[PDB]
Design a protein around this nucleic acid. Structure first.
Ligand SMILES: [Mg+2]
Ligand SMILES: [Mg+2]
Ligand SMILES: [Mg+2]
Ligand SMILES: [Mg+2]
Ligand SMILES: [Mg+2]
Ligand SMILES: [Mg+2]
Ligand SMILES: [Mg+2]
Ligand SMILES: [Mg+2]
Ligand SMILES: [Mg+2]
Ligand SMILES: [Mg+2]
Ligand SMILES: [Mg+2]
Ligand SMILES: [Mg+2]
Ligand SMILES: [Mg+2]
Ligand SMILES: [Mg+2]
Ligand SMILES: [Mg+2]
Ligand SMILES: [Mg+2]
Ligand SMILES: [Mg+2]
Ligand SMILES: [Mg+2]
Ligand SMILES: [Mg+2]
Ligand SMILES: [Mg+2]
Ligand SMILES: [Mg+2]
Ligand SMILES: [Mg+2]
Ligand SMILES: [Mg+2]
Ligand SMILES: [Mg+2]
Ligand SMILES: [Mg+2]
Ligand SMILES: [Mg+2]
Ligand SMILES: [Mg+2]
Ligand SMILES: [Mg+2]
Ligand SMILES: [Mg+2]
Ligand SMILES: [Mg+2]
Ligand SMILES: [Mg+2]
Ligand SMILES: [Mg+2]
Ligand SMILES: [Mg+2]
Ligand SMILES: [Mg+2]
Ligand SMILES: [Mg+2]
Ligand SMILES: [Mg+2]
Ligand SMILES: [Mg+2]
Ligand SMILES: [Mg+2]
Ligand SMILES: [Mg+2]
Ligand SMILES: [Mg+2]
Ligand SMILES: [Mg+2]
Ligand SMILES: [Mg+2]
Ligand SMILES: [Mg+2]
Ligand SMILES: [Mg+2]
Ligand SMILES: [Mg+2]
Ligand SMILES: [Mg+2]
Ligand SMILES: [Mg+2]
Ligand SMILES: [Mg+2]
Ligand SMILES: [Mg+2]
Ligand SMILES: [Mg+2]
Ligand SMILES: [Mg+2]
Ligand SMILES: [Mg+2]
Ligand SMILES: [Mg+2]
Ligand SMILES: [Mg+2]
Ligand SMILES: [Mg+2]
Ligand SMILES: [Mg+2]
Ligand SMILES: [Mg+2]
Ligand SMILES: [Mg+2]
Ligand SMILES: [Mg+2]
Ligand SMILES: [Mg+2]
Ligand SMILES: [Mg+2]
Ligand SMILES: [Mg+2]
Ligand SMILES: [Mg+2]
Ligand SMILES: [Mg+2]
Ligand SMILES: [Mg+2]
Ligand SMILES: [Mg+2]
Ligand SMILES: [Mg+2]
Ligand SMILES: [Mg+2]
Ligand SMILES: [Mg+2]
Ligand SMILES: [Mg+2]
Ligand SMILES: [Mg+2]
Ligand SMILES: [Mg+2]
Ligand SMILES: [Mg+2]
Ligand SMILES: [Mg+2]
Ligand SMILES: [Mg+2]
Ligand SMILES: [Mg+2]
Ligand SMILES: [Mg+2]
Ligand SMILES: [Mg+2]
Ligand SMILES: [Mg+2]
Ligand SMILES: [Mg+2]
Length: 115
RNA sequence: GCUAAACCUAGCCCCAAACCCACUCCACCUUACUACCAGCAACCUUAGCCAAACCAUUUACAUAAAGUAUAGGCGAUAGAAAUUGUGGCGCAAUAGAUAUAGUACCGCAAGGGAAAGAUGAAAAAUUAUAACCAAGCAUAAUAUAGCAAGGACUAACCCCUAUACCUUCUGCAUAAUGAAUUAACUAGAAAUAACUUUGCAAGGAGAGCCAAAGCUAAGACCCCCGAAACCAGACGAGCUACCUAAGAACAGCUAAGAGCACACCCGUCUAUGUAGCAAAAUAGUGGGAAGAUUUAUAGGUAGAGGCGACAAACCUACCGAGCCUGGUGAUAGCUGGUUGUCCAAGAUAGAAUCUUAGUUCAACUUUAAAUUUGCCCACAGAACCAAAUCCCCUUGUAAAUUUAACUGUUAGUCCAAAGAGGAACAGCUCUUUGGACACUAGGAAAAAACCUUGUAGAGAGAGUAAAAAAUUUAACACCCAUAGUAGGCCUAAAAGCAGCCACCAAUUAAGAAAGCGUUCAAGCUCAACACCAAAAAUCCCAAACAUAUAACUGAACUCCUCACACCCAAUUGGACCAAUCUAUCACCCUAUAGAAGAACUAAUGUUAGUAUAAGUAACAUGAAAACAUUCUCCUCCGCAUAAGCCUGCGUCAGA
RNA sequence: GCUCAUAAGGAAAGGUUAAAAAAAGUAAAAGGAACUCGGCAAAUCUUACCCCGCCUGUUUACCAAAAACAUCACCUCUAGCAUCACCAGUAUUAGAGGCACCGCCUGCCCAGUGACACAUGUUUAACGGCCGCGGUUAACCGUGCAAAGGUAGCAUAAUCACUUGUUCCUUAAAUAGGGACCUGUAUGAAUGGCUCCACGAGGGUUCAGCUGUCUCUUACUUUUAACCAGUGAAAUUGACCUGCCCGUGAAGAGGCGGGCAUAACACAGCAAGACGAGAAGACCCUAUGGAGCUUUAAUUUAUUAAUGCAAACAGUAACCUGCAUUAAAAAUUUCGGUUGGGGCGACCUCGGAGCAGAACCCAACCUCCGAGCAGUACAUGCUAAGACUUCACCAGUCAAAGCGAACCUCAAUUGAUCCAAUAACUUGACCAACGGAACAAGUUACCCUAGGGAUAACAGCGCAAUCCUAUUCUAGAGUCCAUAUCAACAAUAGGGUUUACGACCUCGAUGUUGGAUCAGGACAUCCCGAUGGUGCAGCCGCUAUUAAAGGUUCGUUUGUUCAACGAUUAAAGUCCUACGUGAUCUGAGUUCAGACCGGAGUAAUCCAGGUCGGUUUCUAUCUACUUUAUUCCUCCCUGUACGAAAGGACAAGAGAAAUAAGGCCUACUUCACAAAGCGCCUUCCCCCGUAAAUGAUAUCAUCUCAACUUAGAUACCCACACCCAAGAACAGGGUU
RNA sequence: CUGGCGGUGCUUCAUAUCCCUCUAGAGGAGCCUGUUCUGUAAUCGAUAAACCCCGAUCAACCUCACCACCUCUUGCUCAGCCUA
RNA sequence: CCAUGAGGUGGCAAGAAAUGGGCUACAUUUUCUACCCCAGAAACGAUAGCCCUUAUGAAAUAAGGGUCGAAGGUGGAUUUAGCAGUAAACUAAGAGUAGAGUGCUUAGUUGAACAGGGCCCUGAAGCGCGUACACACCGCCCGUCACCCUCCUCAAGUAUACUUCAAA
């Protein structure tokens, strides 16, 4: 027995727990993490921030909603521009975005005093 | 009825209170119980087990301050002061002091250690109580068969049923340990904190301690036996190893640490013995037997040591270092056990750990309480390199979150599918989804895991779920033969089959040839025409019928009369209760509260008697006789003494 | 100290019979070691060899008595001296060591350790070592390195498999014994190499004699056994009203599912089972439980002696005490985890790919890819709503804003407490055994203890990777000729007999192989019986089926079944029986303590290396048991049938020999009023596998898984008391 | 006994000789010149005094009698023979 | 014996590998110029190609005429002859090549040292010693392992033949 005992070590990693934390229809508050995962899964949509680990987190109190909108990234990403140019005429990427439909308003004009 | 069973009084533990004893007569440090004569003696840090999962520094010897400061491989732990101020809710011969006594017994020695008895006013009462109560036997031996029991039965057996208990482990009669019963003893002491009920309240408690509803007081919770092994000093050279002083022994024969051979020293081998003669024996063959020889007496060498012709052998039957005392009831992830009745809830994804036989967290489970949403939920929502899964309103329901507690689980096995390595094998090792087993019920033969089925009782009632293996392949249409010829290439040769070509066509109507056999041709058929699966070793294993009408039998499942808390491992929450003492009327034996040395089918548990092999193994005493005496055999044995014992086969009376 | 057998000293037989088994003695018809690993009890009394040890002597009282231990002889080192020994001694004297007398010898090396301050070197008779690559079965060439590179010598060793060596004998067989070869690659010199005078309870062979060890055992006495009288234990027991076969069953059933059986107890033997009975298996494994031994493992020098300093006095311009070093040997401790049993090999932290395919999720002694970092600012600044969170915790990740300036990329890429530096921001780990004791090794076959078949060596159990047996298409051979016969590439069925594989009860015990008596069963049949084919002119042969009623040798070696060989008969078959049977036996060794040979190891110890020897218990309780024809040789068949000659048979009858069983002492022996064999008599029935009349499905033909015919139980029996050929008692026969 | 030989002894000579002194050149590169011969169809004889600036006083062919290609029996020679 | 011969075109004349010799020049009077012996400076070598192939010719090796006008670096033992027209320098004709240079025969000019001492190396002559040598030191030669091989001695246990028996 040599060269085939257990030289292929290293595979002893636990689960990273990276998925969806607030499914669609849930009343998420401002600041809660919506999901965490590697590689841009759900691109940022309306009222959805992005941290450093390519994660998402709600910014306003509302219900989470997912749609399929066209993808038009920033010209900075030369790789994205190249991939787009490599597509034919009638071609669309259609990525998965995330939205947060706001419920409450930003404020209300209340009566202070009668002068 | 033999053997048995009980008596309870002597004495023990606690403190409550004082501080105790001690030479008539001789004798006692030499060899202790010895009338008598010329020689140093004293003061010493205790170690160690154990806990930090090892272990070195470390670990204990009135109240409050305060378990604070402080010290501490700053971790396990240790831890001050100033200030303060004359009886038993005991024991009653396996209990109580070990005690009738520190008695024999082990013993040369330190050292360890038990029981004696049972009526009373008269035992200078003759004369016995009332038999009854466990274990072993008699009155009284068995009469097909099989966990010693049930339904029964008019009856014992005969009929059907069911695989001893506890512990472990996923799984049990298993052939895994425990066990002969009986009587006695024998194994959960409490903690910061938490729950319930009393009393007062922003205060209570009989200074001190706690206060954004708190404190006080009570009730309720933390097992036993079991090593190897260390420390300090005693006791041990009377046997073994060595040394010292003075003594003893060694026939004879042949002839010098010479040879054979008495006594004598040790035992290389056989046989018997193996609970024997002996916790190391009996005969010869064995080596020596004027010398490194054996031994009588006394003294010296004692464990971190002594000794040692090294056997790492011996030092009082067991020496890789003898026993005792006090630390040690040492420790121990480990074997074993952990006592009365009944009801209810009650099976776990994983991680860390000098770690996978152990511990913590998480998760499962239990108790009391405040809150409201817990599960299948429907459109929809949830990725570029198949069964599926998450959220999910109405809808079935009544379950879920949290607070405060704390023990218990955290080694699993099998089945259907995805698999992973192995041989697309293993009652093979490990995951994912579901079920079962650890929990009873009816079957597949005896089955854990397979099919059906759960809320617990009776009735000599009714209706159902699962439920009984089937099946025998081999013929065959079997009438019948001219020729252009030996076509051509190679083949001396294959002409019809060593090899290739086209494969025509005359027979009236069909192969330049589909097989067989020829070196080669010779011969025999055919295409077509004319009726035509079993075998392995103790002996195969339920009797058994193909022919009376499809439906029966078949549970702890459902129903019928009553009332229902009365079928889980570990754990948890509750209702009762045999015995004793205490305070209460009782008083032919019971109630309210206070306590547990409070409740035995087991811990190769201890004490006492008794079954079991078992009347089996072991065993002796030479013969006749007038018990005067005589006869047969053996002898390396016998005489006195140093070592050692203390009256230990003579008489008198009874055993 | 005495005569050691006599003037001393004692009674081996409680009484009857002599069942079975064992032991102590007497003899034995032919052999004298041929059963046996061994000449191991009893008798002769004895001849020649090898290894080792100088010979005597001692060792493990209590399993190993030696090939070990010690020295008369040689050699190494230390000591210049007197009052307790060493010493009332003095260098030829003593102390500490290596080897083994005597003879031939002790060849080389201080790189490394130790001892000598020897002015830098000595010491190997101290610890230890004496080499490799290509060549006309090798000298000598080309060389590399150090200390030399095994010199002499001995040889298949007590010397790692090769090993049962080669080689010639010793016998009928020789892994037993011995004459020579280095090739012993790991022999080889006072860790001593070789011969030899005497010797060995040391370990292995052998020539002429020897015995019951066996061939084949028998008769007698005693011990001893049974009954009648007495007393009188222990190991052990859950209760037993206790059978057998098939299958299951925590995996070998007297109590389970189905069948066979079963009147009651008692003695006389039994050791197959009740995984039988005595010891918390001694072999394997766990223990942050121990102890012995060894140092260059982690620590302290308590103690001894010498060193430098201090006080301590004499000199000038000599004893104690305290502080650190050195050698000795002393004082405490440990020897981490995984391993489909333990060591060995490998691993110990983290990220990704498939298992885990569509929220998360899960296993690495399953197959892979990577990292203890890498590049520019230093607003990588100070604050703070809400969340994710490697399935716990400790540890990690995103973030609206608020103040201050604007007009980071990557995937793991790491480090907790205490402690230390630091005036103070801040920093300190290959703690990788990476959730991390502040630093600790090797062995135990001299081991102890608490436990484990959670976890091993033998079994049982399940698989069938390996093998064997049969069949299927023929590939290929077999002179034409696949299928008389052999048989590739594959598939279908049976095996658990070999090697493993899994550890499911059996480590508070299942005693391990051969060899002895005894054998039970199965046929994949070696032979005796019957058939078909054949490369069958006959025997000798080959193949396929039935038949297990029977038989299945004598010996030489190595402990080994297996393993080689000599002669037989027709054959010297396989397999299971817990590698059948140790409560029937055996010890040869396999698990032990001591020693030797070569090696590993600085040392203790070990080679799963080789041998010298190594206490084998049981008093029976239960179940169960304890009395009924086989072959070979010979004679008429004889030289027959068969050819080309050699060669050479079928059946039947008869004589004799053995096998196993049933009997006897009158001849022969052991011997005597008996019994036994070596001596003598008897032993008898076919076995299902084939070949044939007669005809249909299938008017042919045709043996019948269509109808019908051929080779196709006899034996023993069932009316008190004395002796016995009957018997342990009981029972039986005779008693004119 | 003759001779050879001697790092063999003694004595006498060497007059560019053997040294004690002195001259131009080889021991530095290119053309010509040779040799053993790898190219080849290609003489190569001597290959240390006795052989190479020897046929060389010269290798476009003539030197070259060596083969790629053709030649002949009277072979200009009563041949060539440079084939040993 | 119908060539192993020679005759008709072609060729070898570059160095696998080793190398002597003739010329070019390795520098300060090298290379340049005047006085026909009145001085200095940079401190110089087409060595071969290409055509006319010169010298000829069927066909061209140092070339007379058009392209290298530079680059090499007096070297260590040893070596050649030279006692004076010698060593060393400065110029021409030509045997022979049809064909020629830097070679060779002849014809010319300038012109050293020491010209003295010894066998230490070498050669010769006279006396003499030794000789295992004689195709004569390039000799004989001694001892290391042996095939076709010729023999012997020792050797523990073995097999065969043989003397002694009775002279007791
Ligand atoms: Mg992975
Ligand atoms: Mg403790
Ligand atoms: Mg501790
Ligand atoms: Mg005070
Ligand atoms: Mg008492
Ligand atoms: Mg008491
Ligand atoms: Mg009774
Ligand atoms: Mg019963
Ligand atoms: Mg229990
Ligand atoms: Mg238990
Ligand atoms: Mg288990
Ligand atoms: Mg049992
Ligand atoms: Mg409150
Ligand atoms: Mg003594
Ligand atoms: Mg002794
Ligand atoms: Mg012996
Ligand atoms: Mg015994
Ligand atoms: Mg002796
Ligand atoms: Mg003697
Ligand atoms: Mg004597
Ligand atoms: Mg002790
Ligand atoms: Mg304890
Ligand atoms: Mg542990
Ligand atoms: Mg147990
Ligand atoms: Mg109890
Ligand atoms: Mg329940
Ligand atoms: Mg750790
Ligand atoms: Mg398993
Ligand atoms: Mg269960
Ligand atoms: Mg019900
Ligand atoms: Mg009791
Ligand atoms: Mg027991
Ligand atoms: Mg008990
Ligand atoms: Mg008995
Ligand atoms: Mg007697
Ligand atoms: Mg008797
Ligand atoms: Mg005889
Ligand atoms: Mg005999
Ligand atoms: Mg035998
Ligand atoms: Mg034998
Ligand atoms: Mg023998
Ligand atoms: Mg003899
Ligand atoms: Mg000796
Ligand atoms: Mg012993
Ligand atoms: Mg002995
Ligand atoms: Mg000695
Ligand atoms: Mg001596
Ligand atoms: Mg030596
Ligand atoms: Mg060997
Ligand atoms: Mg008896
Ligand atoms: Mg009796
Ligand atoms: Mg017992
Ligand atoms: Mg069974
Ligand atoms: Mg049983
Ligand atoms: Mg047992
Ligand atoms: Mg045990
Ligand atoms: Mg301990
Ligand atoms: Mg300990
Ligand atoms: Mg392990
Ligand atoms: Mg978490
Ligand atoms: Mg902002
Ligand atoms: Mg971690
Ligand atoms: Mg660490
Ligand atoms: Mg540690
Ligand atoms: Mg040993
Ligand atoms: Mg096994
Ligand atoms: Mg063929
Ligand atoms: Mg197991
Ligand atoms: Mg075991
Ligand atoms: Mg055990
Ligand atoms: Mg047992
Ligand atoms: Mg058969
Ligand atoms: Mg066996
Ligand atoms: Mg047995
Ligand atoms: Mg020893
Ligand atoms: Mg030796
Ligand atoms: Mg026995
Ligand atoms: Mg009996
Ligand atoms: Mg009985
Ligand atoms: Mg010629």
């Amino acid at each position: 027995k040599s060269g085939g005992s257990s030289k292929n070590l290293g595979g002893k990693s636990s689960g990273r727990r990276q998925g969806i934390k607030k499914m669609e229809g849930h009343y998420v508050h401002a600041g809660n993490i919506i999901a965490t995962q590697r590689h841009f899964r759900w691109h940022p949509g309306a009222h959805v921030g992005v941290g450093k680990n390519k994660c998402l987190y709600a910014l306003e109190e509302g219900i989470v909603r997912y749609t399929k909108e066209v993808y038009v990234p920033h010209p900075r990403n030369t790789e994205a521009v190249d991939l787009i140019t490599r597509l034919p005429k009638g071609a669309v990427l259609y990525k998965t975005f995330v939205h947060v439909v706001p419920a409450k308003p930003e404020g209300t004009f209340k009566l202070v005093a009668m002068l």
